[model samples]
Target: LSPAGKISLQSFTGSSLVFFVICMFNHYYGITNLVVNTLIVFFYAVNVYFFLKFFYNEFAFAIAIRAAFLGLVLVLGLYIKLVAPPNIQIFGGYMSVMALFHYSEFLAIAIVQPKQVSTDSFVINHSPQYTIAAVSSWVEFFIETYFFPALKAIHWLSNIGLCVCILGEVLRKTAILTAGSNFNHLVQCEKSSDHVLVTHGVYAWFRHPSYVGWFYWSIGTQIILINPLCIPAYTLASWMFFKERIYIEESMLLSFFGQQYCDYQQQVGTGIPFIEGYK
Candidate 1:
């Protein structure tokens, strides 16, 4: 949705179009489609519900009804996909609903500059961090959507792994909500709070569980969507960039939390499993 326009209306319309495409894709592809559709719907529904509950003053049940309407949109897309596959492909178009959501929030948050009470000292977008994140974002989009779909044998497994990571990320998100007051993803402050170290749930195991999940999601998307080419550009590029990204974040966290973060780091990993030892 265009953030420049009315946020609620734009998001509603844009979100609706996105679900329709997902449903149509699912219907044409059979059970695989259904599974994907179900997950997509579930993910967006939960996100909208909780986001509104937390950020906006909207009633929580309205979120539920919104989610239900999304399901109905899925059904309509399925019907269209079944009856007119070509039309579905042609008119369904490219819908980056998630991207829109992220961008819109980015704009809103940017404009508001909300009261940022930093739980940790490390700010998110230092020079290196922003560079890496920008490159990672673009690389992720290109690699998953273009390059990976060219491969044959190694393709499916990669896709499955990535999907697992996405789901894991979603689960991690729900867990982070529990952090509540301490849950600051990108905010920065001159000093750190006493509760800077959050060693619980997924955070208990990884200093950057969110990034790990995201890394997996990228890997999974590459596997699932990309074929015909054996290009591993996106995953490789993102990993390399995030490697630096994590180090920067951790260094700042360590400075902020001091021994507290160090103690936490002893038990937790960084990006992937078993690799924390190397870091």
Candidate 2:
């Protein structure tokens, strides 16, 4: 099998293992106990290390380390909320769905997609605006888990948010698949003669369907967790970050594609459909 195929198998297997561990702990031991949850985090960290090491060499080790750190942070925050007073009964469900969503998205992008398109474009060069978005997400998670626990009892409405999040995942995957070899995580003009605009599938509806999906996905995390304060905060923070990013990206596109990109911009709105009129 190819390296990408190997990575895919490892990723899928790792995700499955993590999901199983989460389910077992939540069902039997419960995630409220710090020790148990910490152990779980450790296991995941180990898996992440091995997975990355086996698939990616030292050149990519830095990215793996960052991913592991982020995973640990998220796991700690999740369990911290579980231990907080006024226990959330549906916390387990939320975590389960979140795990599935995150891992599935990873599998789709990092595993299933072509390595040249997915891996090459996976730039880690973080900007200040990117830092703000990342920090805000962590802050929002901490705040929601500790300071502002969901007050309302679990309701069907929570499921609605989960469904929305799932829909966002669908749209995101659609964008990735439709773009095919053209899909990239970074904003750069492909110098290849074959490089062209993708206006089919989700692109036909929104200029940046991936961004739109991500906007909803970020906000949906808070919603499913029932973190009222963080929901709007995430919305605003992500909106601002993406707004600045879109401008920078479009400028680059304009420089590269010239009139063709400008025409596409006019035909389709920036991310959300019909919101361009307000801008």
Candidate 3:
């Protein structure tokens, strides 16, 4: 990673930690929300001051946006956790899961593919579909929670979803870490000489472990919210998304590795059920 990129990642990570601690302490001490919010604003000012002082460039804005955005997310998460009623804490859990997922994507890439690391590696603005899905899920959650609060009360089932989400996160991270420099957020059209095929660790278990992890993770998030409408919608959409991607990706991989990749394909499956990639 470039030195500036590394510093931004650390700074953004630190902002979240500091924000979380301040919120927690506010709750523990019964401090007024007004004071805490002021303190939070103070943090934003300090972040901007430092940002302008050392790194006055266009790229500086991206890191600033990420830090404040996540700080807001952490604040809302704490509100959901502490103030919300029984059935509604689900959003808080989902927020926590998502914040970690997006942030950790950058962290994981930095660890395994440092040369490729950038703020875009955060994948937070992954795609319009990704953004729409989240907004629509929130819409479904609130609409459902308003009319049919009982459905949201299925905390046990949602807890199961949380377990699935966590497992998928771990699996995806393991796949990235295992692949090391071979892993990439974008599918490569041409292989670099250094990009050898990975068929060990999680790869031994699935031909596309990261995709498999993400496929299940998508469904798992809707489940975490207990969103009856989104559960099936997200499942079908994600399955379709990966089906095309895995097929296209395999075509590239097959040509790159030729006989070696074909042999690996024969031994393992795509792990996305029923969707066979290029033969």
Which one wins on lDDT? Answer: 3
Give lDDT tens digits, candidate 2, residues 1-279: 435434444544544456456645675654456586568667767777786788677645543444444344445445434554444533544564454554445445554354552333333336675557545544554455565555434546566767878888888888887886666666774455766778878998887898898789777876766766667887887787678777777777777677777888888887753344212
Q: Write the per-residue lDDT of candidate 3 for residues 80-110, one digit (tens) a residue.
A: 6565676688888888778778777877876
Compared with the true structure, what per-residue lDDT tens digits does model 1 show for residues 1-279? 223223333344545665666565665676345465568778866665555456544432333234334334434543532443332221111112223223332333322333431211112234674456445544454454444433322434443644564575564454355454465555344454545467777777577766666666555543443332322654666577667667676777766777887777776667464344223
**How much does each candidate deviate from the true structure in C-alpha RMSD?**
10.7, 5.1, 3.0
User: By lDDT, is 1 or 2 better?
Assistant: 2
On TM-score, the stronger of 1 and 2 is 2
Error of 3 at 239 (Å): 0.4
The collision pairs in model 3 are none
Q: List the residue pairs that clash in candidate 2.
A: none
lDDT of 2: 0.61
